Design a binder for this molecule. Structure first.
Ligand code: SF4
Ligand code: SF4
Ligand code: FES
Lengths: 83, 208, 687, 95, 118, 113
């Protein structure tokens, strides 16, 4: 119930995406190391806001936009959605 | 250059031209282009807000009594926002002259009605109302010519199908003729006969 | 910079060098032509290009003479017209009187330009020559008589096709370009010559006599017969598909689509899932209304939510049906998401999306100063791309060499042995060939996607990742080059991986009853031994080949041109299909049946229109909503490589492409399989 | 002697007769389906093959401007007859 | 949004059911002529057309299906579909990229162009 | 911006429509008897209310007033005992089959969009 698939969206160039870009370039290897099971799909899409889908039980999905968030705040959301 | 070719009448082109600048003088406020082709066929612009005041002047002598509105020929080009291109063909009988003086309008512009001025346009009116939707200044009645009664469409808008959406037939238990959805058999099997490779370099709009 | 030369009146900043042709064609003026071709090569034969320069004593060849300053070019000038008249009087001096029976005769370029130029009356008084017919293939009939010594076809053939059987023969009168000897021309791009023929000399046999160009509508889209994702203009007529033509695009086909795709359409005309076919008490299927079969599968799929269900994705299948079906599996939390070809995922490569992408565009290949390939030959997966290779080989000049096999590519390539040694000797950089890899900048590293499987192909994966990283270590790379890339042959896995459903590993084929079939074209990866008990297995392909009979309670569905469902190119390019002739009978839009089953399942999908499922794609993909956007942030090999090295797999023998040779290339998907032209053609290449 | 369908009605010269399942066959009931007695196909090969010792020839279909456009049939290969693209009738160069 | 959805006589069904297609028409592959790539045009999406039970004719569904419309520019066509209330899909122009060419480029022993006999 | 047909802002227009409704709403029985419509007259008034509902999304006063221009023009043909009974019945489309907006039925019918 805690998760099945999780995924994020990211502007290729926008300032509100940049800290997140730096994050995926760093710690993503660690978080991905943490979870052999549940995928953390990531997309390059220049959708107006960086995004965070997270499926739970029976396909329901949380969706927090990542506009104007630092990578530390991003991670701050990330531990919150472990379940 | 002759047995097949139609000879070019320079003389009438000269006279029509000179008269064209003459008119260009006379009504600077609405008159624009003074087109003069080798067909001996002169043409002139009018702004739609300038429909009536020009036309009335035309009927009255200057050196051309533009008597008899022979036609209010109409064309619709969807590209231009001023899609409509109302044209006043005219003929000054005393001077045996012919001229084509056109305009433009949008869908909700109440272009001036020459009904008071010519009255010949009591129907050039209602056709070009009905086929299109070119609303007109002040006419005794805007009831439709040609197209039926309950009919909703505006064919000659160069829009919606040549068959139209409507195809009526008598029906049994209703004991009466009823309009129905088209269902054409065989369908107008349109041929695209357009030719790549321009035959007329002399024309040709630049790629720009 | 650019030299100045005058079009008739206007001054023009024309490029240094370059022909008068491109000069007039900059202002938009267009010179009459035949033998010349825009992406071929200049040839002086058939001088329709004649024009006089403003100071020219006599007319020049506009398609060939390089521009230079101080010239002026009155294309409309009388002498040039006398010249064109000189050409057309002669071409028609001996041409056959057979416009009407010509398949090209309804649209031949010779005709249009016969209208544009040349005297209306002719003055022949003797006896024209006429050559005998000269067969060069089952699928490319050649009437000849008609060919105008224009040599565009040999310059195509000898070059990009790589085959040289075609060519000139003889001199003086009764000279002919008829190829020597009886032997058929053959090529994997044999069909494209048909397009390139100005006249009716090279009329295709399968399409012969069938139709006339003006009648046809030209509905457009893209083919999925290749993973190349080539664009297409389709000449349908009267609800029937009359012929396929490529739609040009420099990033992809550059107006030279696969000969296999070109005759694919015929296969749509063979057997089709026309009506629903539910097995009876006898276990035999019978024709059935949708309410029956769909209420039945509605009776099955409410039973086994979550576990004990799976879904066999096809290779040609549209992404949308996958979207709705996985959403169905979401509502029941059925995690299973299996897909035809498996793709290895050390550190889970589905996430980075870039992993499976051919990160360099086919357009981007030309700038590479060095290119390498691994495993399957490009031509039996991307013949277009093979032509791109040979074109670069004829132009850009760079090394290429095969690994794992010496398959008969048209261009020169260094021979190399097999993976276990080569991959490590190159990963080490010890291999002299790898020393050449350090030697040259703008690297490219290709892998046959067939080798991604290879049981222990994960070894080749980590190996090649180490290789590309090592060549990055060699530096001289811009670093944004995205050296790491592969050639997918599948039309569907790339989008499913954009959605990252699963690696597609078939090891899952364990317990689940009531697996659903999407296409299910192969008898290989899946079969009914997965569940000894029930053989109940739902199906929604369109041709009945292989997968359909195994399945029960069959559910017929649309072919690709009919649906407007989208497809993703291997370069990550997104491009939707558009509607054409619509499904033949009870066949319908593919995912619509899914939304219907879900609607009966008590878990109806929130979106209604296909435009609204596309609206859903933005809230998940989110890249399917955007079409021409190949570009993105690109995750870079840093984070990528790190989990690749936290695994490692043993390398092995052997390493062979699936397709081997030409004769095996004619039967892949259900349309290519069922197409009759394919059967005749494979029997041709046999005996 | 048109080939007879299982229903018994004669097939069209372009063979296409309706299936026994086919309800549409009902239209012919009470009436007569019509198909031409004289198939052109048999009449194509019925004719003797004309032969001329020369080489290239010029068929006109019989009748100046009463037939197909003038056409130059080649006879490069004696292994085969030179069927017209129009008349459909064969030619050969006997020697 | 100057909708003329009611000002036009069109049935609401045909304006609801479908989006139209704005685009610039492609050059013939089979023919040299670039000439029709110029001038934009918009066309409605094709629908199913069942065969006539008699005589095997086409039996068209949607009446409007054969419509076609030229435009000077793309924003022009977008403006029409906006004025008229139908949904649409913009498509880009496709002028071929310029290619450097020269008569001698075919030759030269070193360039491996060479070609052959001529 | 551009010069208006007649009414400027909605109320100059809204005034015209009500003038229209009554112009129909009183006229209806006259029509019921001239053509001897078999419809109960309240059905006629209901249809009168309905055609005034289809035009609910109108927002430009030029669109409103142009619609009442055309609608009064239709009233012309109605009152003058032009048209025929059939033309009056064209508004009903009773010969036509009902349309199931439900998507599932739309699946069941045909290829459709
Ligand atoms: S090739 Fe062009 S010209 Fe020659 S016959 Fe066929 S159509 Fe007529
Ligand atoms: S095919 Fe016949 S006509 Fe077309 S180019 Fe080659 S030779 Fe000239
Ligand atoms: S155009 Fe190629 S030579 Fe005349």
């Amino acid at each position: 119930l805690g998760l099945r698939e999780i995924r994020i969206h990211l502007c290729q160039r926008s300032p509100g995406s940049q800290g997140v870009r730096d994050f995926i370039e760093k710690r993503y290897v660690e978080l991905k190391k943490a979870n052999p099971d549940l995928p953390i799909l990531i997309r390059e899409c220049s959708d107006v806001q960086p995004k965070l889908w997270a499926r739970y039980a029976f396909g329901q999905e949380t969706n927090v936009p990542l506009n104007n968030f630092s990578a530390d705040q991003v991670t701050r959301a990330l531990e919150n959605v472990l379940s | 250059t002759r047995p097949t070719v139609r000879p070019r009448n320079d003389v009438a082109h000269k006279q029509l031209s000179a008269f064209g600048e003459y008119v260009a003088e006379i009504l600077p406020k609405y008159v624009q282009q003074v087109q003069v082709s080798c067909f001996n066929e002169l043409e002139v612009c009018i702004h739609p807000d300038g429909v009536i005041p020009v036309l009335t002047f035309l009927r009255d002598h200057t050196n051309a009594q533009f008597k008899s509105l022979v036609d209010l020929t109409a064309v619709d080009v969807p590209t231009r926002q001023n899609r409509f291109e109302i044209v006043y063909n005219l003929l000054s009988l005393r001077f045996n002259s012919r001229i084509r003086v056109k305009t433009y309008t949008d869908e909700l512009t109440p272009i001036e009605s020459a009904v008071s001025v010519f009255k010949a346009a009591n129907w050039y009116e209602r056709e070009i109302w009905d086929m299109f939707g070119v609303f007109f200044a002040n006419h005794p009645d805007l009831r439709r010519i040609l197209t039926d009664y309950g009919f909703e469409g505006h064919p000659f808008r160069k829009d919606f199908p040549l068959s139209g959406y409507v195809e009526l037939r008598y029906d049994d238990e209703v004991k009466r003729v009823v309009a129905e959805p088209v269902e054409l058999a065989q369908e107008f099997r349109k041929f695209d006969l357009n030719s790549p490779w321009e035959a007329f370099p002399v024309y040709r709009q630049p790629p720009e | 910079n650019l030299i100045e030369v005058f079009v008739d009146g206007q001054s023009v900043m024309v490029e240094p060098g370059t022909t008068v042709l491109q000069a007039c064609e900059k202002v938009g003026m267009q010179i009459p032509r035949f033998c010349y071709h825009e992406r071929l090569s200049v040839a002086g034969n058939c001088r329709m290009c004649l024009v006089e320069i403003e100071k020219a004593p006599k007319v020049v060849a506009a398609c060939a003479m390089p521009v230079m300053k101080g010239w002026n070019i009155l294309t409309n000038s009388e002498k040039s017209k006398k010249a064109r008249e000189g050409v057309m009087e002669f071409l028609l001096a001996n041409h056959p009187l057979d416009c009407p029976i010509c398949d090209q005769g309804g649209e031949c370029d010779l005709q249009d330009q016969s209208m544009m130029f040349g005297n209306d009356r002719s003055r022949f008084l003797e006896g024209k020559r006429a050559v005998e017919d000269k067969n060069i293939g089952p699928l490319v009939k050649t009437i000849m008589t008609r060919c105008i010594q224009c040599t565009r076809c040999i310059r195509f053939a000898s070059e990009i096709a790589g085959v040289d059987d075609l060519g000139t023969t003889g001199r003086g009168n009764d000279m002919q370009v008829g190829t020597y000897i009886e032997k058929m021309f053959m090529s994997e791009l044999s069909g494209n010559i048909i397009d390139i023929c100005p006249v009716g000399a090279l009329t295709s046999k399968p399409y012969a006599f069938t139709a006339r160009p003006w009648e046809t509508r030209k509905t457009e889209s893209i083919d999925v017969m290749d993973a190349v994702g080539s664009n297409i203009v389709v000449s349908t007529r009267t609800g029937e598909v009359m012929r396929i033509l490529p739609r040009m695009h420099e990033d992809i086909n550059e107006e030279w689509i696969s000969d296999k795709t070109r005759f694919a359409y015929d296969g749509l005309k063979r057997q089709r899932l026309t009506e629903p076919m539910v097995r009876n008490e006898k276990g035999l299927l019978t024709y059935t209304s949708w309410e029956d079969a769909l209420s039945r599968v509605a009776g099955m799929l409410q039973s086994f939510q979550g576990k004990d269900v799976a879904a066999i994705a096809g290779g040609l299948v549209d992404a949308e049906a996958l979207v709705a079906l996985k959403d169905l599996l979401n509502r029941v939390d059925s995690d299973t998401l299996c897909t035809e070809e498996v793709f290895p995922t050390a550190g889970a490569g589905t996430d980075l999306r870039s992993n499976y992408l051919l990160n360099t565009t086919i357009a981007g290949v030309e700038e590479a100063d060095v290119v390498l390939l691994v495993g399957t030959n490009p031509r039996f997966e991307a013949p277009l791309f093979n032509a791109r290779i040979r074109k670069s080989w004829l132009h850009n000049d760079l090394k290429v060499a095969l690994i794992g096999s010496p398959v008969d590519l048209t261009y020169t390539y260094d021979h190399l042995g097999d993976s276990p040694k080569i991959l490590q000797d190159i990963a080490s950089g010890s291999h002299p060939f790898s020393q050449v890899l350090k030697e040259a900048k703008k690297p490219m590293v290709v892998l046959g996607s067939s080798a991604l499987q290879r049981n222990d192909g994960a070894a080749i994966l980590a190996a090649v990742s180490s290789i590309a990283q090592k060549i990055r270590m060699t530096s001289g790379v811009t670093g944004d080059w995205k050296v790491m890339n592969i050639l997918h042959r599948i039309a569907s896995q790339v989008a499913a991986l954009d959605l990252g459903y699963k690696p597609g590993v078939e090891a899952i084929r364990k317990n689940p009853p009531k697996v659903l079939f999407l296409l299910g074209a192969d008898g290989g990866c899946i079969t009914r031994q997965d569940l000894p008990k029930d053989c109940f297995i739902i199906y929604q392909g369109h041709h009945g080949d292989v997968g359909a009979p195994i399945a029960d309670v069959i559910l017929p569905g649309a072919a690709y041109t009919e649906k407007s469902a989208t497809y993703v190119n291997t370069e990550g390019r997104a491009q939707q299909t558009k509607v054409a002739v619509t499904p033949p009978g009870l066949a319908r839009e593919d995912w619509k049946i899914i939304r219907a089953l879900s609607e009966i399942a008590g878990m109806t999908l929130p979106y209604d229109t296909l435009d609204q499922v596309r609206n859903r794609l933005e809230e998940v993909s989110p890249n399917l909503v955007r079409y021409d956007d190949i570009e993105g942030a690109n995750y870079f090999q840093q984070a990528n490589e790190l989990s690749k090295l936290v695994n490692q797999q043993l390398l092995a023998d052997p390493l062979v492409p699936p397709q081997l040779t030409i004769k095996d290339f004619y039967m892949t998907d259900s349309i290519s399989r069922a197409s009759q032209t394919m059967a005749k053609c494979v029997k041709a290449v046999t005996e | 002697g048109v080939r007879v369908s299982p229903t018994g009605e004669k097939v069209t010269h372009t063979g296409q007769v309706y299936d026994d399942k086919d309800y549409r066959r009902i239209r012919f009931v009470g009436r007569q389906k019509e198909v031409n007695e004289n198939f052109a196909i048999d009449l194509i090969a019925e004719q003797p093959v004309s032969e001329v010792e020369t080489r290239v020839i010029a068929c006109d279909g019989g009748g100046g401007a009463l037939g197909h456009p003038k056409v130059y049939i080649n006879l490069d290969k004696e292994t085969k007859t030179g069927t017209c693209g129009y008349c459909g009738l064969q030619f050969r160069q006997h020697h | 949004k100057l909708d003329i959805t009611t000002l036009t006589g069109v049935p609401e069904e045909h304006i609801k059911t479908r989006k139209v297609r704005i685009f610039v028409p492609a050059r013939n592959n089979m023919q040299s002529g670039v000439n029709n790539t110029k001038k934009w045009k918009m066309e409605f999406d094709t629908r199913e057309r069942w065969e006539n039970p008699l005589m095997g004719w086409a039996s068209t569904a949607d009446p409007l299906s054969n419509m076609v419309l030229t435009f000077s520019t793309k924003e022009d066509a977008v403006s029409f579909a906006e004025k008229n209330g139908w949904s649409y899909d913009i498509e880009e122009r496709k002028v071929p990229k310029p290619k450097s060419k020269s008569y001698g480029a075919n030759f030269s022993w070193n360039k491996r162009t060479r070609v052959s006999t001529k | 911006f551009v010069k208006p047909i007649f009414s400027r802002d909605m109320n100059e227009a809204k005034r015209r429509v009500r003038e229209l409704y009554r112009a129909w709403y009183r006229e209806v029985p006259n029509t019921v008897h001239q053509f001897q419509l078999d419809i109960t007259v309240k059905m006629g008034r209901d249809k009168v209310r309905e055609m005034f509902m289809k035009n609910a999304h109108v927002t430009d006063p030029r669109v409103v007033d142009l619609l009442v221009i055309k609608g009064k023009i239709e009233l012309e043909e109605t009152i003058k005992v032009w048209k025929q009974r059939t033309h009056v019945m064209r508004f009903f489309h009773e010969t036509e089959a009902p349309r199931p907006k439900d998507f599932l039925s739309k699946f069941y019918v045909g290829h459709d969009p």
